[PDB]
């Protein structure tokens, strides 16, 4: 429990989760707006015109990160305010964010700022969006007036949160936004992010000289067999390789998966998206890797499955979100990535749980969430005893947001939010949270 | 507005696994369904029917019930394990109970039908692979010998099969259904003896019996929409369709397989030697009537990221407690394409009802949305019976809330409650008013 | 014995880029094929048409050959890239060729047919994406609108494609054919706009423009049929018969494509969204004949290892230097079948000949062989004639000996032999027999 | 042209392409005996009916053998001479064998004795052949009375030849016997073939406690890009996996390579064929490896294919098959399996070339053959300069033989034979592979 005197501590954000103002300080419409809108894709058709508020509300919300106590608050940068047009900057909402990393440093919190989030503007939506090899420019020119205006005062920079999300999961599955159910336009979409965060990466440290610590943060969930059976170890792989190895292996080895390409073969029948001069770019040396970790998944062969994968049942204990509480699953995951993948420090960009808690006479005693964060803070000391570099931890999430296509019925929080009044109450939780960073900074 | 010719046959229906239990006396062996209930993972809690409504041993009682209704016939089915326990080895007591009850209903004055496949296949015959075995063709001949023998001169009419679509692709395809594997190659040949042991066994008793007892098959239909007036939608359409009505329809009217499904499956099939000379013919027997199972539509979208190209699409109509849309208008278009394009064969529906969250208050539960699905449907079949669609017969899924499936017990289609800790039978809201409907229609006639 | 209508016209046919020559003449700009023959190994050591049969100067020439036959009409096509050598820029120069041409004919007595597209698609189209590419429909109109309005005075029939499938399914799947590409997705796209591109051109002439002349379609057409009587085979032909066949009638005739085929297709292409609302209309729209190139048969087999579960069967059959089959009995199957499921339209046999090892031998050539093949199809026209098949015309495919596209110059299929060194045309046998069998009906005539 | 002091020689035949005698000595039918009748499958109907006639001529091409001065002879063993019936040895069927090994041992000569060379018996193909799992244990029941019998004679044994013919040429394209066209079938007949080598291998090693060098033989050919780009490159990856990796790795990783799995299971959609402990019997260690070399094939990718591949264009001097000649290629294909897979010893237990051999007045002068095998025989010594460790080399073939589906059209032979008269005559080249020999065994001191 002994983290080193280094040891970040922190807790995270996204902004059209959080900041509402949606047709305020220039903002056009995202693609989530126009998600929101079509039918059977979210619960009871929720938005997040105006969410937790946060674009009135930050001066307030950074009294809340004050009292916890952590070194870093995490956010996002919604694109469609600062290119709400192709080629025209909006400095209103670029204000905001560069008047707040100013604030939390001078409130003494590091500001770590991911400059993709999901929120992609309608107006690259509707060229084709990802699926076209043009949106890297785009996202290029986006990413340079961000460094060119907070660099200075920006602590870390990451260039994509969990483009397994934004790719596969929302151009091939059609569950996260745009929706969209086809594999070929998928493979297009990941290709092209990757190859775009390669390139600001390049430009950030070569032209524009820039020291300020960059990387990539990746979702990953580690994948295993029911049985010792043949059939169930393949499927384990191609579970892996569908949310894991498909996207690591071209950031750390500068290569795709033949195994994944041949089992997308099925779908895809050409891969003349792969430009001479992009892997090398994809794998550029970061300074750190970043790890988005909240579940394992528990797999078994399908004959009927193009993947030759379902998911089977688990007996382990579940969260309200159904997904497995496996802190022995996480530290597995760990020592793989250190023995085949990376030796660069690791952070972890977010962890955290929902389950149905009940407002009980101004308070939500949330044992239960209390449990699951600290088993894996337990988890992250146990690592660095082992030298897995594990250098900090950002809790997710600080409020109670849109939780995409869940609405506003799952809450991540620490922070409960009455969304009927915008309320921001301390919840239970941070009972020990902000007590364990105290603590910490005793010792010293 | 909901009027009915004179030999119009009101009546309910059962299956033999969801409602009878007692799954250790009378020589009965384990199926499919006990050992699937379980696996883990596959149905709501690991509910099974060890208990069920415990129907073996109150049958006497629901008789009664029946006759209150004062419905014509009621329609249930026959558990394969009790008459085959072990292959080859006939157990006369558990045909007793079935003899019994078959006499009990002619006394009664009720028209006995009886389904001689429910989905409950005997572990033994599963061990040797099934329906996907060959043989398995020869097994249920041996079980529909026996069971004509001792039962033909007293029932009113036969069903061999029910819903092979879920005995076939959500049991052998999809997995949600027992033995629950997931294999399409697995899944036509499945399907492909169960059609073929159907007709097979519709040819044995005309011809070698020579017996004029009614026989059918029972197909469940879904009609399928498109959600736009775009091609990719009516391709969409036509494969939902393919999967869950023409595979079923085209062998039993056209003596052939659809090569539009065929080709879609060759993803996964990749031989149809299964299927032999002399097999088509026997499938395509003619039959007395036709059955159809009915509950709902399916509205369906494009989908290039799946395998048959399509995906369940929203639907902005009421729905029932099962999330199903309620579409009598859907119901017409579907009746009058049978018509059209397959059969001028008598139609009787088998099934039809609807789950809802049914609360208990007073001893009473105000199923007044159950009341309504039920009239809109009723008063369909009357219209199309006008249009000379001849639709002879209508019986109500279900009479008693039972184990729904992999649903378990959480979910009730009955028009009957059922606590099933104490068994309590209790008649409420409707029932009496499908008693009334009956007795309504009854007493226009002279 | 033949006997043949007074009506019926008797013809031959020849393609622009196969006989033309004059490759960097009259403002001509390469086309694709000019491409496809520099790349290894797709063409017969490395053959091209740069100077070909150099039917451009020497047309002159070739024009009193035609008269000797006696044939009522000609056919020949219309080099895209001497037309349109730069997008927007119309050249008169190589137009003036063409009106020049087929005013000569008219003064000798001749019909001339005119084929818009025969495969020889100009490279600036090719580089924006080609066939594939929706464009493609708009800049085939401007390159058809510019014939129409110079031309159509005095040419007799007009054919917008010459064999999609090859053009299409040929080039841009099996990759045999210009550009060579081998995707199946883009050859849904390819083939759809040449079909589309058909239909507005049809549109074009008699709608706007208010024009009589008969226009159509020319598809290749090959009959299959199953080895054996199996049910895998059964398949077989039936996918074999869509890939070549109902692919192209569907949607000429019935305005749809075949679900079936889509399907199958549907392992490679995941997306129909290239058909628009409105493109099946067009592409069905009437026209005054219907134009079939005939060459032989295929006997398919099952095979499970195929994506299209077939492969060529051994065949029997007496054949040709090519090996392809001698199927004058299937050649009336495939007729029938037309006027039972497809058209009533006027059958034109735009394209029927063959190729054999023809050596010159002292000034004359005895190819009794391909006389024979002829010889068998049309007594066969004439029969179908008598059964009512309403066939007004054939094309003796070819004239010249001329470039075979893949294979080169290694395959003769001309009524004239051709030394392509010195360019000499010499007479074979089979055209002063044609020209005879004309001659004889002529002299029948009146 | 260096080559180690214990380096052998040899040349190799197979049974049913040299042995005739087809319905003498109590032989049932092999799947070659129908496969050669159906239709359009082999050049003309030709079969092995009469063949080179070894079976009757035995004592003469075993001079041939001694004159040539190889230390070694590779022959293959016709399983239905063997078991004719079920269950049923015909000891008969063994003289003949039993004679030919006890007549080169005599002559000096060491006999490497291949088991299974494509020639499955009829009883078991109707029974579904290498399909039907029972095939391991049929091999078992065929190998052991080969071993209890002949493994005091034999110097070497061979359990498989090319189980990629066997299998995927087979069973998946229809080329071979018995002409099935079903990947199902091909990757269930593949891991029987290869589960039963392992299995009757183990049977040596551990019951019969037997030291005689036995282990398998593969054709790899290796897989060029015929660009850099990484769609070409995807295309190499699968027809590489297709042809070598499908058979080396379970034979020495014990696992199989599952983007080949993935690619297959567009036909393929059950491992259940893959018992417990069955990869494990497979890689159980052996005292050679086995490697029959040809050729090497330049693919490039095509969008249209199932497994994403056509073969690309090559430029390469080409021998009469067509195949391209690859001395180069094969110099890096033996490293690659240094590097990832064996340190085993390695044998090339086939190599050779098919020209247009034209008689003239007692003669066919093929230096074109000859300088083939010199340049691949220049290779093997340069990589055992490089200590790649390759102990043997066996020349393809013998004589001119039955060459499958192209027939007797095609002539690998060093030795010519005239089918009419079955004359047996020695071309230069045969005194040339002879004088090599002899000129190997004469530097000693």
């Not at 956010?75 to 604030?103: D, V």
């Not at 996260?176 to 390139?199: Q, T």
Request: charged share 25%; with cysteine; glycine share 8%.
């Amino acid at each position: 429990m002994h983290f080193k005197k280094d040891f970040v501590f922190g807790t995270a954000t996204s902004s059209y989760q959080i900041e509402g103002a949606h047709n305020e300080g220039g903002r056009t419409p995202s693609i989530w707006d126009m998600f929101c809108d079509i039918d059977g894709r979210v619960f009871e058709k929720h938005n997040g015109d105006v969410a937790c508020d946060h674009y009135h509300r930050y001066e307030e919300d950074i009294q809340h990160i004050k009292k916890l106590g952590v070194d870093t608050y995490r956010f996002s940068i919604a694109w469609p305010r600062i290119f709400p047009a192709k080629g025209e900057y909006n400095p209103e909402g670029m204000a905001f964010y560069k008047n707040l990393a100013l604030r939390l440093r001078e409130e003494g919190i590091k500001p770590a700022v991911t400059i993709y989030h999901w929120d992609l503007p309608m107006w690259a939506h509707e060229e084709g969006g990802w699926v076209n090899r043009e949106s890297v420019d785009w996202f290029l020119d986006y990413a340079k007036v961000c460094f060119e205006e907070l660099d200075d005062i920006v602590d870390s920079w990451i260039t994509h949160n969990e483009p397994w999300c934004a790719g596969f999961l929302g151009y091939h599955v059609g569950v996260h936004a745009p929706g969209h159910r086809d594999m070929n336009e998928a493979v297009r979409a990941v290709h092209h992010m990757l190859l775009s965060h390669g390139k600001a990466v390049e430009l950030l440290k070569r032209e524009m000289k820039s020291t300020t610590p960059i990387g990539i943060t990746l979702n990953l969930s580690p994948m295993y067999a029911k049985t010792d059976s043949a059939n169930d170890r393949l499927a384990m792989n191609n579970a892996d390789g569908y949310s894991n190895r498909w996207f690591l292996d071209p950031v750390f080895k500068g290569e795709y998966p033949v195994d994944m390409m041949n089992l997308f073969s099925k779908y895809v029948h050409n891969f003349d998206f792969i430009q001479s001069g992009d892997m090398e770019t994809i794998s550029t040396a970061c300074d750190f890797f970043g790890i988005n970790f909240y579940s394992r998944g528990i797999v078994e062969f399908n004959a009927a499955n193009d993947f030759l994968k379902a998911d089977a049942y688990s007996d382990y204990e579940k969260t309200g979100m159904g997904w497995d509480i496996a802190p022995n699953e996480f530290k597995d995951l760990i020592r793989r990535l250190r023995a085949e993948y990376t030796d660069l420090p690791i952070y972890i960009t977010e962890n955290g749980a929902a389950f149905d808690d009940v407002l009980e006479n101004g308070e939500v005693h949330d044992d239960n969430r209390i449990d699951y964060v600290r088993q894996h803070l337990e988890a992250v000391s146990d690592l660095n005893d082992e030298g897995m570099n594990i250098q900090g931890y950002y809790l997710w999430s600080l409020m109670d947001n849109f939780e995409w296509s869940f609405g506003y019925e799952k809450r991540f929080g620490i922070l409960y939010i009455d969304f009927e009044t915008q309320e921001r109450i301390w919840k239970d939780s941070a009972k020990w949270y902000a007590g364990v960073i105290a603590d910490h900074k005793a010792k010293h």
